[PDB]
Amino acid sequence: TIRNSEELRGKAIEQLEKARARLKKVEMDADQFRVNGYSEIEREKMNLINSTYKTLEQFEN
Amino acid sequence: ANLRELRDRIGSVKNTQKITEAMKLVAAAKVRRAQEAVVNGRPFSETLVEVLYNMNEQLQTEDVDVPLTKIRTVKKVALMVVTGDRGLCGGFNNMLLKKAESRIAELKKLGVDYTIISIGKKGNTYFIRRPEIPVDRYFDGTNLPTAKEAQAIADDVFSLFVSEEVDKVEMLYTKFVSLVKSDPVIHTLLPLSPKGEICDINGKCVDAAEDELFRLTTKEGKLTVERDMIKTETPAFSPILEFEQDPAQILDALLPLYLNSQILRALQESL
Amino acid sequence: VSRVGSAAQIKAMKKVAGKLKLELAQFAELEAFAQFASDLDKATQNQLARGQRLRELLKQPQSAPLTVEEQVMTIYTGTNGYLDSLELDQVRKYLVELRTYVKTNKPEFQEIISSTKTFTEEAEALLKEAIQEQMERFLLQ
Amino acid sequence: MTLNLCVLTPNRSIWNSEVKEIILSTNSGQIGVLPNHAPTATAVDIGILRIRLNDQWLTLALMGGFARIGNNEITILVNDAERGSDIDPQEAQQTLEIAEANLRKAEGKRQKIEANLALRRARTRVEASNT
Amino acid sequence: PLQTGLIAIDAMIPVGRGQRELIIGDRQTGKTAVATDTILNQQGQNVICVYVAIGQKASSVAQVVTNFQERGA
Amino acid sequence: LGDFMDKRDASIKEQLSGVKDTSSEVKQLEEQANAVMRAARAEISAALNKMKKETQ
Amino acid sequence: LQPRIVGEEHYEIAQRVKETLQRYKELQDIIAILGLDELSEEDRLTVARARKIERFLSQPFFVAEVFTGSPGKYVGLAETIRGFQLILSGELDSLPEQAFYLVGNIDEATAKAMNLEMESKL
Ligand SMILES: Nc1ncnc2c1ncn2[C@@H]1O[C@H](COP(=O)(O)OP(=O)(O)OP(=O)(O)O)[C@@H](O)[C@H]1O
């Protein structure tokens, strides 16, 4: 009982620690991915802000 | 715009034919599931009848005095009718309620003070629309009939008989003997023989021709059903059982199981 | 009808088109059994659900024409069953996100479908990887 | 390593696996069975059939029936036996309060026996769903 | 192959270059929509598209041609 | 003669308490691991839509 | 009736209303010959919501109060959208069908339902 119980609590606390490190990785993942995705949403927006002048010129001709 | 009218009418008849053949096929699949339930619930009652037959052959000289198996001939009657759940029914519920009227006709004529325990939704609709017949309890099929409906009906019939108020609790139902003809039967339920056979309303042991375990096989190219006589029953041997409980209490605890078995099998056969 | 037939398709399209046609035919067969879907065999329920979520990828909005690679990947996903678990109000959104994701991230798939005009095993593997990745990213919601 | 045990409701066989130690709540009280028991065919009250899998002690929720002990092939024909613990006790006490409530209104002679049996089944339901 | 951009046509009723395929339907079921989707889908391929508006309303043709000019087809 | 078995049982006591608080921490940390990417993905689409209104 | 012209909420509620009415139009013969009681749970709900929608599309006119016997009502777009959204969202499933008949807006539907329940109790 003591070997299996210490094994259970030890494995579960090491699960806490390794999934805590994995939590650190996911927090960094979300922060970095928001830093990336801001750029792509601004990219499609600026595609619109240029395409308005593009269609302006297309009808200017 | 008459040709579009005929075109849409033809389309509606095509769709109605499609959905009627779909209902036919899914009803056949549910017939297969009902025979599955029946042949799966059988061996419980097989071991029950072999145990009970041995027990009552050891308990004839005794005094057993169990309230379910006593014969109180002061002649009240509790006829229980079980009908179909939903509609289109072929001609199920009509002939069921018709035999119900015929039975209460012979009953009231003899002044035996009958009553009715309606089980099916169509039957209980018929009875709430006709209050000239007295009725005790109401049941339905939205609840599953394989366990809970049968358990509730057994509870109510047990509470009706053990509290010795009415005699002769019989059940009118419809054993599946043919795909076109389904003639209803009236079998008694609680005033049972201690040997433990299903009886007629006369009592003349219709287990002789009960024809258990129906199955479905086609004959040439159309669907039919096959019903044989005897299957996988081993009732003969009677070993020493060493009763720890008092023998009257053993049957007193055994007979509710037989009540539940008979009620459940009758529900499954009518379904 | 089309009297020209499969000769008007590229080699990539026929492979998924055969399975799409067979599964849509089975759904058209079992369409009457939809009201009694509860009391049916599991294979029949599978064919019915596959049909009513293959019908959902044949919906399109006006003036948004799919390229041949996008529809190859859409038909492949639907006809194999990498959306047999989703709900009917999610198939269209998931397919839009998956198509944009694959076009943005895995251009080897578009290039192998476009230059060789066949559904290569490498395209199959790339599409399964992209399906798993977008399945995780969409289960995130 | 034990006797063959089959708990059988009317409609189905619940489970026919073999376990070590069974406490059988009869009409005469609780009785324990052993592997290689001499055959005793008893009754069973609306009560608790506890088992022992030699790894963990488990309870079974049943609403009555009958039992038979044979040559290590024992058969217990029950009324309503739900395998293991399928329910949680909150809806059990929500059934206990309403069963004791309707015991009062159900006061006629047949309703006495009916409400009493409903009570003995609710009590065995909750004392089986304690674990 | 003639890519019509609609997945249901491209997989089930495929159209080839040199085939004559009939967009037959009822009133207001999407026939002009299907033709316009095909003409927009012809952007990458070098297909010279022709749209013959026979007995249409003039503002309908104006809407179609402005949609063409907007999408770049 | 009592504290010697008191310790040997108190080990199992602290063990089960640790596993209980452990399971609580597991569900909370997986909740936060879902929550950080969920918050990023939701708020990025929020700002997308809001700035897209002014863009239109 | 296109999203870029009419707004996404307007277009989506119009598409939902039309899909519900078309599904009710297709259930019309499986109901009329095979029984409304045997229907499934999703389809009975569709049928009830479609009958309620069909009642709610009616509206008394100011130049037709000589036929309807009731004063006409002007219904703006927003209250129409909100009413049909209430109907097919699942809130108003406890109202009678006649509560939606010849009412201006959805608050008038609820008021007529209240008067109907009053007449039904006493
Ligand atoms: N794939 C689609 N997705 C969304 N809306 C569509 C689609 N196809 C057509 N519509 C809509 O259906 C309506 C009618 O479309 P369209 O003009 O193509 O039909 P039509 O048959 O040409 O009409 P008519 O019979 O007057 O010529 C339009 O409002 C259009 O927006």
JSON list of C-alpha atoms in Angstrom, two decimals, chain B residues 40-41 44 47-48 51 137 146 151 155-156 159-160 163 239 241-245 249-250 253-254 257 260 264, chain D residues 8-13 26-28 39-43 65-66 68 77-80 109-110 113-114 117 121:
[
{"chain": "B", "resi": 40, "resn": "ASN", "atom": "CA", "xyz": [-33.67, -13.71, -24.44]},
{"chain": "B", "resi": 41, "resn": "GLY", "atom": "CA", "xyz": [-36.08, -13.36, -21.52]},
{"chain": "B", "resi": 44, "resn": "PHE", "atom": "CA", "xyz": [-35.25, -16.98, -16.64]},
{"chain": "B", "resi": 47, "resn": "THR", "atom": "CA", "xyz": [-35.44, -22.02, -14.58]},
{"chain": "B", "resi": 48, "resn": "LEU", "atom": "CA", "xyz": [-38.31, -20.44, -12.66]},
{"chain": "B", "resi": 51, "resn": "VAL", "atom": "CA", "xyz": [-37.65, -24.63, -9.62]},
{"chain": "B", "resi": 137, "resn": "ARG", "atom": "CA", "xyz": [-55.01, 2.31, -13.41]},
{"chain": "B", "resi": 146, "resn": "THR", "atom": "CA", "xyz": [-39.22, -4.31, -21.32]},
{"chain": "B", "resi": 151, "resn": "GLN", "atom": "CA", "xyz": [-42.73, -3.90, -13.11]},
{"chain": "B", "resi": 155, "resn": "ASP", "atom": "CA", "xyz": [-46.76, -3.98, -8.49]},
{"chain": "B", "resi": 156, "resn": "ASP", "atom": "CA", "xyz": [-50.35, -2.85, -9.05]},
{"chain": "B", "resi": 159, "resn": "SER", "atom": "CA", "xyz": [-51.26, -4.75, -4.46]},
{"chain": "B", "resi": 160, "resn": "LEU", "atom": "CA", "xyz": [-54.74, -5.50, -5.82]},
{"chain": "B", "resi": 163, "resn": "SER", "atom": "CA", "xyz": [-54.74, -6.88, -0.21]},
{"chain": "B", "resi": 239, "resn": "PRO", "atom": "CA", "xyz": [-31.95, -32.31, -6.46]},
{"chain": "B", "resi": 241, "resn": "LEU", "atom": "CA", "xyz": [-32.06, -27.93, -2.21]},
{"chain": "B", "resi": 242, "resn": "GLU", "atom": "CA", "xyz": [-31.75, -27.71, 1.61]},
{"chain": "B", "resi": 243, "resn": "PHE", "atom": "CA", "xyz": [-34.35, -25.02, 2.30]},
{"chain": "B", "resi": 244, "resn": "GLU", "atom": "CA", "xyz": [-33.00, -22.51, 4.80]},
{"chain": "B", "resi": 245, "resn": "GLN", "atom": "CA", "xyz": [-36.17, -20.39, 4.66]},
{"chain": "B", "resi": 249, "resn": "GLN", "atom": "CA", "xyz": [-42.11, -18.13, 2.72]},
{"chain": "B", "resi": 250, "resn": "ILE", "atom": "CA", "xyz": [-40.10, -19.59, -0.17]},
{"chain": "B", "resi": 253, "resn": "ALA", "atom": "CA", "xyz": [-41.15, -14.93, -2.32]},
{"chain": "B", "resi": 254, "resn": "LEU", "atom": "CA", "xyz": [-41.16, -17.01, -5.53]},
{"chain": "B", "resi": 257, "resn": "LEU", "atom": "CA", "xyz": [-41.28, -13.49, -9.86]},
{"chain": "B", "resi": 260, "resn": "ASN", "atom": "CA", "xyz": [-43.55, -10.45, -13.31]},
{"chain": "B", "resi": 264, "resn": "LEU", "atom": "CA", "xyz": [-43.65, -9.17, -19.09]},
{"chain": "D", "resi": 8, "resn": "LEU", "atom": "CA", "xyz": [-30.79, -12.80, -13.83]},
{"chain": "D", "resi": 9, "resn": "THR", "atom": "CA", "xyz": [-33.58, -10.25, -14.09]},
{"chain": "D", "resi": 10, "resn": "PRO", "atom": "CA", "xyz": [-36.71, -11.33, -16.05]},
{"chain": "D", "resi": 11, "resn": "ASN", "atom": "CA", "xyz": [-35.72, -9.65, -19.33]},
{"chain": "D", "resi": 12, "resn": "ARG", "atom": "CA", "xyz": [-31.97, -10.32, -19.44]},
{"chain": "D", "resi": 13, "resn": "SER", "atom": "CA", "xyz": [-28.94, -11.76, -17.73]},
{"chain": "D", "resi": 26, "resn": "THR", "atom": "CA", "xyz": [-32.64, -13.10, 2.64]},
{"chain": "D", "resi": 27, "resn": "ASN", "atom": "CA", "xyz": [-36.02, -13.07, 4.34]},
{"chain": "D", "resi": 28, "resn": "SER", "atom": "CA", "xyz": [-34.08, -14.51, 7.29]},
{"chain": "D", "resi": 39, "resn": "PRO", "atom": "CA", "xyz": [-26.38, -26.29, -1.78]},
{"chain": "D", "resi": 40, "resn": "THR", "atom": "CA", "xyz": [-28.92, -24.08, 0.02]},
{"chain": "D", "resi": 41, "resn": "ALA", "atom": "CA", "xyz": [-31.88, -22.74, -1.96]},
{"chain": "D", "resi": 42, "resn": "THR", "atom": "CA", "xyz": [-33.18, -19.73, -0.02]},
{"chain": "D", "resi": 43, "resn": "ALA", "atom": "CA", "xyz": [-35.34, -16.68, -0.66]},
{"chain": "D", "resi": 65, "resn": "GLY", "atom": "CA", "xyz": [-36.45, -12.29, -5.98]},
{"chain": "D", "resi": 66, "resn": "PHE", "atom": "CA", "xyz": [-35.09, -15.74, -5.17]},
{"chain": "D", "resi": 68, "resn": "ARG", "atom": "CA", "xyz": [-30.29, -20.92, -5.46]},
{"chain": "D", "resi": 77, "resn": "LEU", "atom": "CA", "xyz": [-33.40, -15.06, -9.93]},
{"chain": "D", "resi": 78, "resn": "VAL", "atom": "CA", "xyz": [-34.10, -11.45, -9.00]},
{"chain": "D", "resi": 79, "resn": "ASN", "atom": "CA", "xyz": [-36.85, -8.95, -9.69]},
{"chain": "D", "resi": 80, "resn": "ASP", "atom": "CA", "xyz": [-35.09, -5.67, -10.58]},
{"chain": "D", "resi": 109, "resn": "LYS", "atom": "CA", "xyz": [-55.87, -0.95, 2.49]},
{"chain": "D", "resi": 110, "resn": "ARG", "atom": "CA", "xyz": [-54.19, -1.87, -0.80]},
{"chain": "D", "resi": 113, "resn": "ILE", "atom": "CA", "xyz": [-49.02, -2.62, 0.96]},
{"chain": "D", "resi": 114, "resn": "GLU", "atom": "CA", "xyz": [-48.23, -0.68, -2.23]},
{"chain": "D", "resi": 117, "resn": "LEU", "atom": "CA", "xyz": [-43.23, -1.93, -0.91]},
{"chain": "D", "resi": 121, "resn": "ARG", "atom": "CA", "xyz": [-37.54, -0.47, -2.64]}
]
